[PDB]
Amino acid sequence: MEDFVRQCFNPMIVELAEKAMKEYGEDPKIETNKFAAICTHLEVCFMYSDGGSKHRFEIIEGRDRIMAWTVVNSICNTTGVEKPKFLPDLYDYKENRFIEIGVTRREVHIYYLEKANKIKSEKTHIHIFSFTGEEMATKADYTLDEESRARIKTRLFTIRQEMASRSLWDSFRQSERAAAELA
Ligand SMILES: CC(C)(Oc1ccc(Cl)cc1)C(=O)N1CCC[C@@H]1c1nc(C(=O)O)c(O)c(=O)[nH]1
Numbered sequence: 027m028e029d030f031v032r033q034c035f036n037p038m039i040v041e042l043a044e045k046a047m048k049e050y051g052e053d054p055k056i057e058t059n060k061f062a063a064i065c066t067h068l069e070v071c072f073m074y075s076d077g078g079s080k081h082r083f084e085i086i087e088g089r090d091r092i093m094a095w096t097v098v099n100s101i102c103n104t105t106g107v108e109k110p111k112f113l114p115d116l117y118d119y120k121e122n123r124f125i126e127i128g129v130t131r132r133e134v135h136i137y138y139l140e141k142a143n144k145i146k147s148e149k150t151h152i153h154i155f156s157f158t159g160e161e162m163a164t165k166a167d168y169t170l171d172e173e174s175r176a177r178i179k180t181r182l183f184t185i186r187q188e189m190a191s192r193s194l195w196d197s198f199r200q201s202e203r204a205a206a207e208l209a
């Protein structure tokens with residue numbers, strides 16, 4: 027699994043994921059499912075910004091959380107957008123709204139419901155992707171054009187298939203449920 031992560035992911039995404047887990051006291055060599063899940067979520071955030079113009083998105087995910095709040099503050103002060111209660115993943119400069127990106131191995135609408143209750147902000151856009159080519163966005167507003175989201179779904183389906191060929195998928199899918207159960 028650790029071998030798969032460094033094989034399928036850009037080494038900068040890998041280092042970002044390693045840097046993130048170390049700052050939270052987690053070993054990437056042990057919590058291998060979370061390692062792959064952080065890499066996958068980070069890649070989707072990068073592929074999401076590619077779907078718009080070079081003026082379109084500000085990527086908040088993958089940066090130092092303390093510094094990421096200063097940019098959130100600068101955006102809210104400049105644009106007048108209400109400040110979110112949790113750090114989002116992107117800011118949309120065109121629609122002038124923050125975006126939460128979800129990547130789940132569970133069902134998309136159940137995952138949306140959990141994010142919507144936890145975010146509990148309104149005006150923070152939610153877009154969920156699954157490894158089964160499904161997606162769900164707030165009020166059916168998918169933000170990106172069809173070709174941009176197709177690239178994301180295909181990439182996630184690709185990751186699933188190659189995990190499935192290494193017998194790693196079923197452990198990856200069950201880990202999110204295990205993380206959800208412990209409460
Ligand atoms: C998506 C991911 C990696 O799933 C897993 C999967 C398996 C395991 Cl063992 C642990 C987590 C996660 O880290 N999750 C699941 C929901 C909570 C958290 C999350 N955090 C942020 C953030 O910004 O901190 C997000 O932006 C966000 O989309 N998800």
Ligand SMILES: [Mn+2]
Nearest residue numbers: 087113114115
């Ligand atoms: Mn995030």
Ligand SMILES: [Mn+2]
Nearest residue numbers: 115126127128
């Ligand atoms: Mn997210």
